[PDB]
Nucleic acid binder design. Structure first.
Length: 280
DNA sequence: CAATGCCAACTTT
DNA sequence: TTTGCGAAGCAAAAAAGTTGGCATTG
């Protein structure tokens, strides 16, 4: 067939698998990129690497590696239904990508927290909850008061299905955060069905929280190496503090893994220990 | 205005 | 992260999070 017409067949395939909405979207976007990037011909290995290197060229290595993967799978499916016989993607180079996002430190957190003094109250409250519970923003915006029962905040992580009970008697010492104290302030000051509500006592979207955290960051005027820290970085911050304040085991469970494997990268400092000397 | 949601195109977990 | 394939560790699969730009409405 033609690449395009086959991409259409491939996505209908993908539409199955049991994939979640967001996942499908991620895949669709990689397929849409392939379109713009390649002709409609039938059959190119160099034609393919031409596209990929075009991404690695402008520093979008992550995308390159993700596209390459999707292209290759589309090809294996084509070879299966018998349309092609060679996976000209296999003969291509798997691009190397390193996380550019820098980790956030306890001190940096305090500065962003102050800089957030110019933001709605839910921001700072969202920041405290994020660090004391080590949960993903996506879940934090789901927490309803009905989820708290007898000193425990029940959480069924959306991304993994993992189910955990977080004790409210919790608190982070290095930062002076008491979960019960934070929760109270959340009930009073915000007052919504969700523990994290908007100015209009309505449910917030992870996207917004992220975004306001980002504003406050710039507002703090802090400098970072590589891509700046984002709201998700509080998850890792949470882990790394709790590791020291309690134990690696504890931090693992709080974060929530299926594996029961204490591998974890949230515990990694990713160089923040090192102090790169300026040059005033 | 300013707070928010939505679509998109990237990067992370 | 989690799974997969091969049996130690990366590559790939699945499902987020990040944030600019446009549009909407208190």
């Amino acid at each position: 067939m033609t690449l395009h017409s086959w991409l259409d067949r491939y996505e209908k395939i993908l539409a199955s698998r049991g994939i979640k909405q967001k996942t499908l979207i991620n895949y669709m976007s990689k397929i849409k990129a392939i379109r713009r990037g390649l002709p409609d011909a039938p059959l190119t290995t160099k034609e393919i690497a031409a596209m990929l290197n075009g991404y690695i060229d402008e520093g979008k290595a992550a995308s390159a590696k993700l596209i390459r993967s999707t292209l290759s799978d589309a090809f294996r499916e084509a070879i299966a239904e018998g349309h092609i016989t060679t996976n000209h993607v296999a003969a291509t180079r798997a691009a190397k990508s390193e996380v550019r996002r820098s980790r956030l430190t306890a001190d940096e957190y305090l500065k962003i927290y102050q800089a957030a003094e110019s933001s709605p109250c839910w921001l700072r409250l969202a920041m405290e909850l994020a660090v004391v519970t080590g949960q993903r923003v996506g879940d934090l915006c789901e927490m309803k008061w009905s989820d708290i029962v007898d000193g425990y905040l029940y959480v069924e992580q959306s991304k993994t299905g993992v189910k955990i009970a977080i004790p409210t008697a919790l608190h982070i010492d290095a930062l002076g955060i008491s979960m019960k104290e934070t929760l109270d302030k959340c009930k009073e000051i915000l007052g919504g069905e969700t523990i994290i509500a908007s100015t209009r006592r309505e449910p917030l979207s992870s996207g917004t929280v992220s975004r306001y955290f980002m504003r406050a960051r710039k507002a703090s005027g802090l400098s970072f190496e590589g891509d700046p820290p984002t709201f998700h970085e509080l998850r890792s911050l949470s882990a790394r503090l709790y590791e020291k304040q309690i134990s690696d085991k504890f931090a693992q469970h709080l974060l929530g893994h299926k594996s029961d494997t204490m591998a974890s990268q949230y515990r990694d400092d990713r160089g923040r220990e090192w102090d790169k000397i300026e040059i005033k």
